[PDB]
Amino acid sequence: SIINFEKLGCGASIQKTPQIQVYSRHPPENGKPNILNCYVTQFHPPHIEIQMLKNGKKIPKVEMSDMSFSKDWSFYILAHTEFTPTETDTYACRVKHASMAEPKTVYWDRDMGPHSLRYFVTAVSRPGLGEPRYMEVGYVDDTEFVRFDSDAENPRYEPRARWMEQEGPEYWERETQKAKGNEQSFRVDLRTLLGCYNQSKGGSHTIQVISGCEVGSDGRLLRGYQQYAYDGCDYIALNEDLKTWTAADMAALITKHKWEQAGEAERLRAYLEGTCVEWLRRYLKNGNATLLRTDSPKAHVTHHSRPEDKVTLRCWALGFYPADITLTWQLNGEELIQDMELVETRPAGDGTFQKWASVVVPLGKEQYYTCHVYHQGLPEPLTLRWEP
């Protein structure tokens, strides 16, 4: 259960480039149906246009994940489409974003314990196009379990995991109505931040909050979060002592001084130590079965033939959960950290993740290299070698 937010009240009335990977859900064999993904990350502002192209031409039925953002405030989203890969068909993903002069097209190539309850809030103004879009997204240990999105005709808190369905009607009504009250607080703050940052009234702007608690096995609060960003930059944050605020710039000093006078750190302390902890506990009971599951990586090495007497070994980790993983190549028992290539961990789209690490080795020397896979679901690290 998210807190009811206090208005920022900063006083009476910057862009990040997307990163793109394009890859299939399952290893591509020609003729068999599959899923092509276009994973876009690290971008701000959140408005973005993503097209998937087949042989130069737009692909019509392209589904898209709901948009999320990460602890560094940048947004991310998964686009995907069904496709049956063939030998000569070319696929690609094209991204239009205000941080880029021109749309970026990225082609697909067929080779190359403690617990937390956190809420991720977004409010984006859209002058001329509608009311600000407001979202609340709840995560129990990085698993999304509830969501409120204002862009519906009758906005409602929705379960996002089957184990939330057992909460009664009284719960969803209370959350829904708290969300609509929260929505109005951010609408007012979006108006007000314009003056505070001396901005024009026709531009789109963004408020983001991360709010919640991390709780140890003993049931005691390990860390509390209440941090705000305006246009993708720190604005204000409760300190680890849960008594004082860190204001990232001058406009936030007005909010801080105000929240000091109002005792807002103390209201947060109480929510964080009590209410947040107690609800986390409740969501853990409901989700007991599913939330604790891990899936360990199945790994394998692939071989790719380069110019001259160099070859590339690629080490793959597929179908693992959670996303945290380490891949390393070794030669003679030393790690080749400084000369190997790797991709950012990426969702398969069925709820699990993929990663690979590659190294360039001499032709005929493939059996001198060993790949290591470290994942928390493994009883023991995996060790693998290329094999024909």
Numbering used by the authors: 1 to 13, 24 to 122, 143 to 418
Question: What did the authors write?
Answer:
MHC Is are heterotrimers consisting of a transmembrane heavy chain (HC), β2-microglobulin (β2m), and a peptide antigen, typically of 8–11 amino acids in length. Major histocompatibility complex class I (MHC I)3 molecules present a diverse array of antigenic peptides, the so-called immunopeptidome, to circulating cytotoxic T lymphocytes. Here, endoplasmic reticulum aminopeptidase 1 (ERAP1) and ERAP2 trim peptides to the optimal length for stable MHC I binding in the final editing step of the antigen processing pathway. The construct consists of SL8 peptide linked with β2m and Kb HC in which the C terminus of SL8 is tethered to the Kb-binding groove through a disulfide bond between Y84C of Kb and a second cysteine within the peptide-β2m linker.
To avoid complications arising from consequent lowering of the macroscopic off-rate, we utilized a disulfide-linked SL8/Kb single chain construct (WT-SCT). The structures were resolved to a resolution range of 1.90–2.40 Å and showed the same topologies for β2m, α3, and peptide-binding domains. By contrast, no difference in the levels of WT-SCT was observed when ERAP1 was expressed. The peptide-binding domain of WT-SCT displayed remarkable stability as evidenced by the root mean square deviation (RMSD) of the corresponding Cα atoms with respect to the X-ray structure. The average value of 1.2 ± 0.1 Å suggests that the overall structure of the WT-SCT fluctuates around the crystallographic coordinates at the simulation timescale.
